[PDB]
Amino acid sequence: YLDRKLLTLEDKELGTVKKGYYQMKKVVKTVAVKILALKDELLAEANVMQQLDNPYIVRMIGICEAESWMLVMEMAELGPLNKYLQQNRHVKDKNIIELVHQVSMGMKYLEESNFVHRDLAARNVLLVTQHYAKISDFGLSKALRADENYYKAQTHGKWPVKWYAPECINYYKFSSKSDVWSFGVLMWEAFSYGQKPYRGMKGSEVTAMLEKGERMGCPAGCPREMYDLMNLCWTYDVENRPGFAAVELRLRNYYYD
Ligand SMILES: O=S1(=O)NCc2ccc(Nc3nccc(N(CCCO)c4cccc5[nH]ncc45)n3)cc21
Numbered sequence: 001y002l003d004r005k006l007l008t009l010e011d012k013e014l015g016t017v018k019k020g021y022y023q024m025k026k027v028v029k030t031v032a033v034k035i036l037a038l039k040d041e042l043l044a045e046a047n048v049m050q051q052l053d054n055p056y057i058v059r060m061i062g063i064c065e066a067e068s069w070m071l072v073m074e075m076a077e078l079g080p081l082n083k084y085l086q087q088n089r090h091v092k093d094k095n096i097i098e099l100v101h102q103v104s105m106g107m108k109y110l111e112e113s114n115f116v117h118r119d120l121a122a123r124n125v126l127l128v129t130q131h132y133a134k135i136s137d138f139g140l141s142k143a144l145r146a147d148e149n150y151y152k153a154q155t156h157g158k159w160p161v162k163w164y165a166p167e168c169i170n171y172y173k174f175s176s177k178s179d180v181w182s183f184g185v186l187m188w189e190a191f192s193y194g195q196k197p198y199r200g201m202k203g204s205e206v207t208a209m210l211e212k213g214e215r216m217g218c219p220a221g222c223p224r225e226m227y228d229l230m231n232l233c234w235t236y237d238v239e240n241r242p243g244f245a246a247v248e249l250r251l252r253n254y255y256y257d
Pocket residue numbers: 014017032033034058071072073074075076077078079080126136137138
């Protein structure tokens with residue numbers, strides 16, 4: 001738990017979200033703060049992110065119980081990737097490849113830590129700099145049990161279907177391979193400069209489209225290798241869909257080529 005005394009908030013708003021500062025041992029650290037049901041979701045996120053430690057996942061500083069309930073993270077100054085790219089269409093393809101490779105290195109670690117994100121989308125990638133991305137928003141994330149490969153969704157809550165693999169929609173099964181499907185949608189978003197996927201379509205319409213074997217097209221100016229990778233992530237049969245080690249490798253090879 002954090003010390004309220006050591007936390008300072010801006011008035012300006014970023015429930016509610018605020019930018020702040022927390023006095024660490026000697027340096028002052030810029031932080032982003034969620035300020036409060038909606039509480040169990042924030043507790044689940046705190047519980048997960050306290051077990052995570054990776055350069056490509058947003059770091060939790062801690063929980064402050066004061067006048068309000070607060071979840072304090074290190075600040076990723078530039079904000080969500082979808083919004084950033086929407087306002088910065090000059091960003092080169094090679095820079096996008098760089099950012100999406102970083103996300104895949106982050107997801108490779110999660111996979112290895114046996115956690116499922118369950119909400120991997122461009123809106124949940126935050127930028128530290130134009131060349132440094134972190135995965136955020138672990139509200140729906142689940143620590144897999146030692147004896148299982150997947151999480152079985154029970155209660156009906158947030159359901160971002162446009163990022164969900166068929167086995168999630170059809171069998172309520174979430175695994176690292178389902179996160180791979182979502183990563184594919186995230187790539188598509190990033191190479192489309194933060195445009196929403198399957199625009200104009202209902203969730204049930206997206207599902208019907210995918211079952212016919214149809215996929216979203218190649219965004220303008222997306223190199224074909226990256227589009228080929230999106231299609232691989234969108235492999236229907238989860239058995240034959242790649243995991244984050246295979247996905248990360250292919251981005252690494254391409255990027256460094
Ligand atoms: O709230 S914003 O989308 N409005 C513009 C802007 C600019 C920078 C950040 N950066 C940032 N950097 C780290 C964490 C964090 N947030 C707020 C995200 C809004 O949901 C968080 C606070 C607490 C827990 C969190 N988990 N994931 C993000 C996050 N936000 C966030 C935003």
